[PDB]
Recover the amino acids of this structure.
């Protein structure tokens, strides 16, 4: 035994399943129509929505 | 082939249906998506997307700036995307007050690493850097998203407003007193060889000259002291191999009446810049003159 | 809505497996010698140009004179090539041995190395797409190895040639070919090396007189330091017609070296897939 008594500290990670409760119409979401944007490349054209 | 088809006016994307509209017309189906008019359809400017660490984004939170790619030989991220304003902290062509302000504002952790990488290697700035044109959006975070134009007129998505490009005042240089309605703008790097370090200067130059030979002639005329310093180091210290007292890169065309002088504010600190509103980007590579 | 395209017809028959092999090159770069509309398959690639006496730099010059094209979909009995126009953007296949990053500048080099499909008297070969710093490094190293070709017998030269031959880049460590065969130089390499060495040699004994004459007048005053540097080099170690011939020789020899001095900045790159073989870029003249 050396002349000190060290204390250790370590972390453990758990995987859990949650339950989340809320009231009727407590938050309101305001949305518009989805809008499309274009990006052009020769072999493949992509659109963002 | 027929005469009427040949004589007929060219095809009109101006009023003809977009492809998605054609498909949904064909099947007679409707999605919730507002499919008719595509954003960026008429965009001529070529756009790139870049990811950058959070420290460098300062002074880019205001749209419009030169975005530069710098090299680092480490295995981990080989390139770091740096702004022209931060690059001034290294140049000897910046007043003490402006350099102190930039040094105070950019004191985030990531910025100083780039400054270390800039001068930890033997090679000069010329071989280390490359230009990516102008940056025009922000999306902040621990890692931020930038979008940038490499052959462009510089504009917002709806083109509701033109976006200017800002240059710090100390770097801005003019070699003529009267300006033709068209003039080009260049990036200029010059080196001082008399000092112990190869001390670099950073310049941005507006000129009505488009032909390389005369521009280099005027540059060698104005930078005579720096050229003499290069020759002096070459003669004084053999077995050393210096090169290219100055380098040139072409970056822009603009209508001279557009130029304005303006102030720029971030972190409630105030910077002085020169501004070009109706700007456009044309990109060439670096080239050497002696 | 059609666009400008180049039609190519394979004169030899193509089996189904060969077409499936070729279709993997959807958007690779292919050089063509002349801008015709209906080209024959023998003209594609760089195979017709390769030779047993002519060297690499001849291929570089011919590729500079060449017209660059991009590929389009291969279909029944015909393949379509799209010639690019400046300042639009296109998709290219990274056939080169070097990976790319955003904002890299690219240039085209003649090749040095699966293999590509061949015919009875024909093979298909495509040039390299390489970032500019590596192109400079490889040209410098190959030219300097051309210089050591004369001294190869001594072991120092062998070790130095081996060290020069290896090249390192971002996660790339390939080896380039030794520009000598059977202790002899290919003739184009001989001409280029001799031209550089001569333009170096001529300047050493020609500049002194003209420099010392101009020294009397320079208000920029660095030409006098140039004179002093040349005199220090001297310390380290004629009829007018001969003089005029020597000046002409100097400039013609310099022009001969111009084949290797300047780089065509063909492409600048936009973000790349993890499929990194494929990348997008903007075409530049």
């Amino acid at each position: 035994h050396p002349g000190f008594a060290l204390t250790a500290v370590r972390t453990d990670t758990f995987e859990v399943d949650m339950l989340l409760y809320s009231g009727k119409s407590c938050t309101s979401v305001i949305i518009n129509n989805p809008i499309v944007t274009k990006e052009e490349r020769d072999i493949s054209t992509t659109y963002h929505v | 082939m027929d005469a009427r088809a040949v004589a007929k006016r060219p095809r009109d994307p101006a009023d003809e249906d977009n492809e998605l509209v054609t498909a949904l017309k064909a099947k007679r189906e409707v999605n919730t998506i507002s499919v008719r008019y595509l954003y960026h359809a008429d965009h001529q400017a070529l756009t790139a997307r870049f990811f950058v660490p959070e420290g460098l984004v300062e002074f880019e939170a205001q749209p419009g700036a030169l975005l530069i790619r710098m090299e680092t030989g480490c295995d981990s991220p080989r390139h770091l995307y740096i702004s022209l304003y931060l690059l001034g902290i290294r140049a000897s062509n910046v007043s003490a007050s402006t350099r102190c302000l930039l040094e105070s504002v950019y004191t985030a952790s990531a910025a100083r690493a780039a400054l270390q990488w800039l001068d930890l290697g033997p090679h000069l700035l010329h071989r280390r850097l490359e230009t990516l044109g102008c940056v025009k959006t922000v999306s902040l975070g621990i890692t931020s998203l930038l979008t940038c134009v490499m052959r462009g007129y510089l504009y917002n998505t709806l083109k509701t407003e033109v976006f200017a490009l800002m240059i710090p005042k100390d770097m801005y240089l003019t070699w003529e007193e009267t300006r033709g309605r068209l003039q080009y703008v260049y990036l200029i790097i010059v080196y001082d060889y008399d000092g112990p370090e190869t001390r670099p200067g950073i310049y941005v130059l507006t000129s009505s000259i488009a032909h390389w030979q005369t521009l280099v002639d005027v540059a060698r005329g104005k930078f005579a002291r720096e050229r003499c310093s290069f020759v002096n180091r070459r003669i004084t210290r053999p077995r050393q191999i210096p090169l290219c007292t100055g380098v040139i890169q072409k970056l822009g065309w603009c209508l001279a009446d557009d130029i304005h002088t303006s102030f720029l504010v971030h972190k409630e600190l105030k910077l002085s810049v020169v501004r070009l509103d109706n700007f456009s980007v044309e990109l060439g590579d670096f080239r050497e003159f002696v | 809505a059609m666009e400008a395209n180049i039609f190519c017809t394979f004169d030899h028959k193509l089996s189904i497996a060969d077409v499936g092999k070729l279709t993997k090159l959807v958007a690779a770069v292919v050089p063509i010698p002349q801008r015709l509309h209906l080209i024959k398959h023998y003209q594609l690639g760089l195979h017709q140009f390769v030779d047993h006496t002519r060297g690499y730099v001849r291929l570089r010059g011919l590729l500079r004179n060449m017209t660059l094209t991009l590929m389009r979909r291969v279909e029944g009995n015909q393949i379509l090539l799209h010639v690019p126009t400046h300042g639009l953007l296109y998709t290219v296949l990274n056939t080169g041995p070097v990976t790319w990053e955003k904002g890299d500048a690219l240039c085209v080099l003649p090749p040095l190395f699966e293999n590509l499909l061949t015919l009875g008297q024909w093979e298909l070969v495509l040039p390299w797409i390489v970032p500019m710093p590596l192109a400079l490094e490889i040209n410098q190293r190959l030219l300097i190895m051309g210089l050591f070709s004369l001294d190869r017998s001594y072991e120092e030269v062998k070790a130095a040639v081996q060290q020069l031959q290896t090249i390192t880049f971002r996660d790339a460590t390939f080896t380039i070919p030794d520009p000598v065969i059977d202790q002899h130089l290919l003739i184009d390499m001989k001409t280029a090396c001799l031209s550089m060495s001569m333009v170096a040699n001529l300047a050493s004994e020609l500049t002194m007189t003209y420099v010392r004459k101009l020294a009397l007048e320079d208000s920029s005053m660095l030409l006098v330091k140039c004179q002093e540097l040349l005199m220090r080099l001297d310390r380290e170690r004629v009829s007018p017609d001969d003089e005029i011939a020597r000046l002409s020789a100097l400039f013609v020899m310099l022009r001969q070296l111009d084949d290797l001095i300047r780089e065509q900045v063909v492409f600048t790159v936009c973000d790349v897939s993890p499929d990194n073989k494929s990348a997008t870029c903007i075409f530049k003249g």
Notes: The radius of gyration of chain A is 27 Å. Chain A touches chain B at residues 33-39, 47, 49 (CB under 8 Å). Residues 42 and 48 of chain A are 17 Å apart (CA to CA). The first strand of chain A starts at residue 35 and ends at 39.
